[PDB]
Design a protein around this ligand. Structure first.
Ligand SMILES: CN1CN([C@@H]2O[C@H](COP(=O)(O)OP(=O)(O)OP(=O)(O)O)[C@@H](O)[C@H]2O)c2nc(N)[nH]c(=O)c21
Length: 165
């Protein structure tokens, strides 16, 4: 008895537009580790629904194109942003890695590559946020910028990212 929604990072994803195919690709992390990832190719749109935040995300092959997040505070917002940056598969995300990706669960099972990324950045996102890039923003009604330290800005924002008012 089957929904087309899936879970990732504690968010329920639902594709609302586009399609993708996959290819496996070896990437090099910022910690000099080689990691085999399943890369999705194609333009897609998704809704994300979590317990404390919701989002809409557009992406293409290893690119976050746009993200809008709504959340009840800075931490719930940042959790949603991290999941979307990992989910995007961006090379700047892969290059912000600073530790070994050999995490296990409480059963001694190795997390899969996408979950290794998630766990790494859920533990510390500061390099992720610093290296993602920012962009000047226009005064768009209903939307506010968010800086790399997760505080609001009407002037600049993480590249491709906005927070809904
Ligand atoms: C980046 N991804 C990840 N993903 C989906 O996100 C979910 C979690 O990703 P994952 O843990 O790597 O995939 P899973 O298939 O569980 O991994 P495993 O290889 O261990 O079986 C899966 O349903 C995967 O198909 C995606 N789905 C779509 N449509 N587009 C995308 O760009 C992405």
């Amino acid at each position: 008895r089957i929904s087309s929604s899936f879970s990732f990072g504690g968010f329920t994803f639902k594709r609302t537009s586009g399609s993708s195919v996959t290819k496996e690709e070896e990437v090099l992390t910022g910690n000099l580790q080689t990691l085999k990832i399943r890369v999705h190719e194609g333009y897609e749109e998704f809704t994300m629904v979590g317990q404390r935040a919701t989002a809409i995300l557009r992406k293409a092959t290893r690119r976050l194109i746009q993200l809008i997040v709504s959340g009840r505070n800075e931490q719930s917002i940042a959790e949603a942003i991290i999941v979307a940056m990992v989910f995007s598969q961006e090379d700047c995300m892969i290059k912000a890695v600073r530790g070994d990706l050999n995490f296990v669960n409480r059963a001694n099972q190795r997390l899969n590559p996408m979950h290794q990324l998630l766990r790494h950045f859920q533990k510390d996102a500061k390099v992720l946020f610093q290296n993602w890039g920012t962009e000047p923003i226009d005064n768009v009604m209903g939307m506010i910028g968010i800086l790399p330290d997760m505080t609001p800005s009407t002037e600049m924002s993480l590249r491709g990212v906005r927070v809904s008012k």
